[PDB]
């Protein structure tokens, strides 16, 4: 799913797909603590999965 | 219940769609680049309605 738009859902930091999740349906595969120190930083994110 | 069967039964907006409501059947050309390409797909949604 990834390699068939590869030239879209490919984003280049961490930030630049913040702005993706919160203008369309998109979702991340990123991982870590990015997403822990994102989650209370504002409560209009929701980490989803272990 | 036949409200609730026929509000289950959404109408089609996308491959997606066609590919879990099996109702409504659907096929492309035979030997032209849309049968080439799902027959390589591995993205289990194109793939489950190229099967």
Same mark, same amino acid.
């Given at each position: =799913?990834? @390699? @068939?738009?590869?030239? #879209?859902?490919?984003?280049? #930091? ?9 203008? #369309?349906?998109?979702? =991340?595969?990123?991982? #870590?603590?990015?997403?822990? =120190?994102?989650? /209370? ?5 929701? /980490?989803? &999965? &272990? | 219940?036949?409200? *609730? ?16 409501? *099996? ?10 680049? *849309?049968?080439?390409?799902? !027959? !390589?797909?591995?993205?289990? *949604? ?6």
């Amino acid at each position: =799913f990834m @390699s @068939s738009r590869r030239q #879209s859902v490919l984003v280049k #930091s961490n930030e630049e797909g913040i702005q993706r999740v919160l203008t #369309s349906d998109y979702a =991340f595969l990123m991982e #870590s603590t990015t997403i822990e =120190f994102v989650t /209370q930083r504002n409560c209009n994110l929701t /980490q989803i &999965g &272990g | 219940a036949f409200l *609730t069967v026929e509000r289950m039964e959404s109408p089609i907006d996308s491959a997606d769609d066609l590919a879990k409501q *099996t109702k409504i059947e659907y096929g492309a050309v035979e030997d032209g680049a *849309t049968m080439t390409f799902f !027959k !390589k797909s591995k993205i289990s *949604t194109y793939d489950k309605m190229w099967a």
